[PDB]
Each structure stands twice: as C-alpha cells, then as structure tokens.
C-alpha cells in the first residue's frame, strides 16, 4: 500500500476520490504485515509529514502513519529509535535543516506513539540531555514554543537535578536574545504567543522546582542590568515578570540597589530595560517592577540616574498611555515620575505636545473607562501646568482640550505636589 499511497499523493485525483483511497490506506494498517511493509510505510508518511508539499499531504502522513503505529507498535518502535531520533536533531531531515520546527514536531508525535514501549526510557534520557544543547544554543522563538509544547506534555524530557537550574538559566538568556524581524501584523500576534508558550514552561518549571525560581530571576537581573554595548536584551524578558510574588521582587530590587559591588551604570541599565517591558504587548503588571526601582533609587539617592533617565524614557512612557491594557500602569509610571520631577519643567514639557491628541482621541470614544483614565490624567496635568506656571501659549490648547474634566482646586494640587522629590544638582 505504500506504492499507492505515494502514486496518489503526487496524483491530481479530485479531493473525494483521493479521501477514499487514503481511508482504504488506513484501513490497511489493521492487517499482519511483515516488518519491510511496515518499515516502507513509516518511511513515506514520515517523508509526506515533513516534506509534504501542502496541508492536504502532511495530514494523510500524519493519519497513515498514527494507524500503522497504532496496529504495528513494535515495528514503529524499532523505525523511530534513538539513532534516528538523534540524526533528526543533529543533520535534520532531506531538506530540512535541523533546527526546522516540523522536525521537533514530529519528535514530540513521535513520543506519543512510543510512550507505551520501553525504548521510550533511553528516549527520554536522550532527549534531557539534547534539550538543554538546543537551549543553550539560543533556539528561534517558534521553535522554543514547540520544545516548550514538547516538554509540557513529556516532563521527562527536562532536564533534571542541578541541569535543571542550568537549564532554567540558559532559557532565560535565550528569551532575552527573542527577536522578530517580520513588521507584519500576523507574525507579531504569533511572536507574542510563541513567547507566552516559552514563559509558561518556565512558570511551570517554577512550581514544580521552587530551587529554579531564585536563580532563574538572577538571570533576568544579570541581563536587564548588563552594560555589554554589543548586546540588547529583548523585551520579551517581560513574559516572565507577570506573576512574581511580590517580596520576591523586593529581595531583588533591593540587592540591585544596595549591594556595594554594582556599579551605577548596571543600576541605570536595569532601569531602562525594565521601563522597556511596558512596550511588551501583555505588560499588565511592569509598573509594580518600574516603580519599585524607582522608589528603591531614590533611597540610595541615585537621583541623576532618576532624572537622566526619566529624560530619556518619559516620551515612551506618555505613548505606552495608547495600548490599553499596559495604560494604567503606563499612566502609574507617568505619574511617579512627573510628581517626582520638580526642579524643571523639562520631563512634562517633552509630554505636553502629545496630550491634546491623547485627549481628543480618547473622550468621546464612548467607554466609560476612557473617561475614569482621563479624569486621572487631566488631574496630573493640571498639576504639571500649577507647578510649571507661566507657559501660557505652550499650555492654552491642553486646558482646552480638557476643560470639560474636573479641576483639582489649588489646596488639593499643592498637596499632591508634596510628593518627595528629586533632589537635583547630586
Ligand atoms: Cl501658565
């Protein structure tokens, strides 16, 4: 049946007729068949998975060779073996080379049909060690997302004992090297979600070995707070921030902070790595960590960083207030640093060409938490505008763009503006 099967995949049969005879191919798989007839069919519906030219033929792949597997386990057994699986991840496939997401794939199908046979064991001991290689080898995020699905479905496959910190680490700094060239749309949803893919293992990882979750976060530490001029970590390092206890930010924050050996430069890079993950599309919960640093300098008064940093990112902070989920926490950023700025109207005046259009874009957009985020805002500029006084042409299109929100009276505007500030000149 192989020989049909092969004619009719390279035939231009109608779609019908071309169903019918592969059912009859999967039919075939529930008869005794010698070991050369179930080796020449795991040979071509293993060719039609991962060199099958369209959709239509690497599904009768995948659905001849699950009933073969199924009725001739064995057999299936001695074709996908540790020599094969081997060559698979280290010279790839006809013309695929082997970093080729479909090869991984198949790995992970492949195990699936195993599980049950004892070859599986060596397998699995084989795999440990070959997964933690492609990690270190700073793996595409498309592929790191399927080694994920893999792993998730095959925990024995990770590596174990202290490989498992090793491990941890190594896909931290492999996240940070994430990276999407494509500017098109649909590429960009499916980055995001092949990074999520990636973070959740780890999240998971975490639970299951709470030893990896401390070493795991210095990692990301020694990343956002590199000074390597060559080398940017990415954004995607954000993925992994949502859901940290927050004494374990503490612990972190306050070692980055306080500890004698860090150099300011190293304090400045964390800084303006971590105000960057609010650019990462699920950035929810970045603030908790940006505000924690900035309050965390200000303790040790590092306050040019603070200043000379806010100069730098504050533009990019106003902008983030655009995407509405990062948007409360954009607007907690904002807020911390423009109240705390208050030696020069530099940091706000850098905003200001940007509110009108914010406002107008959101006020009558019809959603009443459109209108709860401006009440907030106008509230903050019109302390900007009270503390940075006597720019009356500058501020005369914000106050109209804005004079239908409520005004903090001036008792209320200077107790806001007690707020501790930065000393300048430090
Ligand atoms: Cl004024």
Same mark, same amino acid.
């Given at each position: 049946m192989d020989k049909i099967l092969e004619g009719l995949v390279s035939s231009s049969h109608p779609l019908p007729l071309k169903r019918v005879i592969v059912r009859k191919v999967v039919e075939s798989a529930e008869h005794w068949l010698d070991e050369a007839q179930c080796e020449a069919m795991f040979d071509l519906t293993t060719r039609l998975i991962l060199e099958g030219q369209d959709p239509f033929q690497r599904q009768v792949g995948h659905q001849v060779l699950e009933a073969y597997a199924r009725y001739h386990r064995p057999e299936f057994e001695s074709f996908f073996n540790k020599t094969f699986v081997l060559g698979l991840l280290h010279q790839g496939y006809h013309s695929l080379d082997?970093?080729?997401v479909a090869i991984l794939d198949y790995i992970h199908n492949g195990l699936k049909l195993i599980? &049950?046979?004892?070859?599986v064991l060596d397998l699995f001991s084989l795999l440990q060690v070959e997964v933690l290689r492609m990690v270190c080898e700073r793996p595409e995020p498309q592929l790191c997302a399927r080694l994920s699905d893999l792993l998730t479905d095959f925990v024995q496959c990770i590596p174990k004992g202290k490989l498992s910190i090793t491990f941890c680490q190594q896909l931290v700094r492999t996240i940070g090297h994430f990276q999407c060239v494509s500017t098109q749309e649909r590429e960009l949803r499916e980055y995001v979600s092949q990074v999520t893919k990636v973070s959740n293992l780890l999240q998971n990882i975490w639970k299951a070995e709470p030893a990896t979750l401390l070493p795991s976060l210095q990692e990301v530490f020694a990343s956002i707070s590199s000074?390597?001029?060559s080398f940017e970590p990415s954004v995607? #390092?954000? &993925? /992994?921030? %949502?859901?940290? *206890?927050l004494q374990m930010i503490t612990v972190l924050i306050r070692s980055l902070t306080?500890?004698? =050996?860090?150099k300011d430069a190293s304090m400045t890079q964390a800084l303006c790595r971590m105000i960057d993950w #609010? &650019?990462? *599309? /699920?950035? %929810? +919960?970045?603030d908790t960590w940006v505000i924690a640093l900035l309050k965390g300098l200000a303790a040790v008064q590092k306050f040019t960083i603070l200043i000379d940093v806010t100069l730098l990112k504050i533009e990019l902070v106003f902008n983030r207030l655009w995407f509405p989920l990062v948007r409360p926490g954009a607007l907690a950023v904002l807020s911390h640093m423009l109240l705390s700025? %208050? +030696?020069?109207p530099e940091a706000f005046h850098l905003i200001v060409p940007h509110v009108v259009n914010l406002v107008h874009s959101f006020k =009558?957009?019809? /959603?009443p938490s459109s209108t709860a985020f401006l009440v907030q805002l106008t509230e903050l500029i019109h302390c900007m505008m009270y503390h940075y006084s006597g720019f009356p042409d500058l501020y005369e299109p914000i106050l109209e763009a804005i004079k239908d929100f409520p005004k903090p009276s001036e008792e209320k505007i200077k107790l806001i503006l007690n707020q501790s500030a930065w000393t300048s000149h430090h």
């Open positions: 082997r970093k080729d599980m &049950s046979c004892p070859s000074t390597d001029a995607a #390092l954000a &993925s /992994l921030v %949502q859901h940290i *206890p306080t500890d004698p =050996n860090v #609010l &650019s990462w *599309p /699920l950035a %929810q +919960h970045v700025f %208050q +030696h020069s =009558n957009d019809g /959603l």
